[PDB]
Amino acid sequence: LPEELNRVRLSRHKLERWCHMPFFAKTVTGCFVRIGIGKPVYRVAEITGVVETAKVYQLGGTRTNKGLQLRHGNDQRVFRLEFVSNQEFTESEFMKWKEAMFSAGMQLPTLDEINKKELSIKEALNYKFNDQDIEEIVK
Amino acid sequence: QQPMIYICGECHTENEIKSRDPIRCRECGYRIMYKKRTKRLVVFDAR
């Protein structure tokens, strides 16, 4: 179902806060983003690791140089956080992802995994910034 | 869901300062910041 899948989808507007929050390699690793390839076609790639680009690009008022190790089944390459689409998982893209995962041999993540993963986002949103994260943030 | 927006005294940047939080601008770290104007109805006579 592409509806439950949209609960583990990180729109560009929300991640602007998490661009600097630590534990980043632990919350996003397991979510699915709608990255752009390019004409209006899209592929559901998998957030595997947290990489950094040498290209510092301004993402609205905030600015970022980090990359994202995304991969659509077998085709993996570097990606920047500007090309991700706020569009939800459509049906044709959902089936295309299903065919890219059944063609690669990767197991489909069990629904219970998604249900336990979506709450990580809301608990990270409501995290009290009481520790020394503000100082590393400002640096 | 109102996070209590403050205005950095130096940067003039808006800052969200909920309870139990240190006052620092997340841009500068500056320690002085001012509340933004009210949202209520401010009406004057021009008297």
């Binding site: 729109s11 560009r12 507007h13 929300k14 990255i35 752009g36 390839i37 390019g38 004409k39 609205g60 990606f79 920047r80 500007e82 090309f83 991700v84 689409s85 706020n86 569009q87 949103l125 | 869901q1 996070p3 949202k39 209520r40 109805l41």
Partner: peptide, 25 residues
């Protein structure tokens, strides 16, 4: 009265702001 509707600041994207493509650059 003096109130504000919506009450949901996080993701009112209102589509969006012209998402740039990867294969366009």
């Amino acid at each position: 009265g003096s109130r504000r509707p919506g009450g949901m600041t996080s993701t009112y994207g209102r589509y969006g702001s012209q998402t740039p493509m990867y294969g366009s650059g």
